[PDB]
Amino acid sequence: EGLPCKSPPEISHGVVAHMSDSYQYGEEVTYKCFEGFGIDGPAIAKCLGEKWSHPPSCI
């Protein structure tokens, strides 16, 4: 079936607040932007096997 997810990548001029060690399948993360970047969209991502879903717009 797979693929299982591993550590989520970095995001557009942002970081993660919930940096865990075990990411498999059916998980979400907190794709937050930094200070000096205006955020548009949600601020989270989801695990889609090997890739992640919804990246934010930190404009």
UniProtKB/Swiss-Prot annotation:
Sulfated on tyrosine residues. Disulfide bonds join C5-C47, C33-C58. Residues 3-59 form the Sushi domain. It is found in: Secreted. Expressed in the retinal pigment epithelium (at protein level). CFH is one of the most abundant complement components in blood where the liver is the major source of CFH protein in vivo. in addition, CFH is secreted by additional cell types including monocytes, fibroblasts, or endothelial cells. Changing E10D: Associated with hemolytic uremic syndrome and basal laminar drusen. Glycoprotein that plays an essential role in maintaining a well-balanced immune response by modulating complement activation. Acts as a soluble inhibitor of complement, where its binding to self markers such as glycan structures prevents complement activation and amplification on cell surfaces. Accelerates the decay of the complement alternative pathway (AP) C3 convertase C3bBb, thus preventing local formation of more C3b, the central player of the complement amplification loop. As a cofactor of the serine protease factor I, CFH also regulates proteolytic degradation of already-deposited C3b. (Microbial infection) In the mosquito midgut, binds to the surface of parasite P.falciparum gametocytes and protects the parasite from alternative complement pathway-mediated elimination. Homodimer. Also forms homooligomers. Interacts with complement protein C3b; this interaction inhibits complement activation. Interacts with complement protein C3d. Interacts with CR3/ITGAM; this interaction mediates adhesion of neutrophils to pathogens leading to pathogen clearance. Interacts with complement factor I. (Microbial infection) Interacts with West nile virus non-structural protein 1 (NS1); this interaction leads to the degradation of C3. Sushi 1-3 domain represents the minimal unit capable of cofactor activity. The property to discriminate self surfaces from non-self surfaces depends on the C-terminal region made of Sushis 19-20. It is linked to Basal laminar drusen: Drusen are extracellular deposits that accumulate below the retinal pigment epithelium on Bruch membrane. Basal laminar drusen refers to an early adult-onset drusen phenotype that shows a pattern of uniform small, slightly raised yellow subretinal nodules randomly scattered in the macula. In later stages, these drusen often become more numerous, with clustered groups of drusen scattered throughout the retina. In time these small basal laminar drusen may expand and ultimately lead to a serous pigment epithelial detachment of the macula that may result in vision loss. Complement factor H deficiency: A disorder that can manifest as several different phenotypes, including asymptomatic, recurrent bacterial infections, and renal failure. Laboratory features usually include decreased serum levels of factor H, complement component C3, and a decrease in other terminal complement components, indicating activation of the alternative complement pathway. It is associated with a number of renal diseases with variable clinical presentation and progression, including membranoproliferative glomerulonephritis and atypical hemolytic uremic syndrome. This is Complement factor H. The chain holds residues 927 to 985 of 1231 of the full protein.
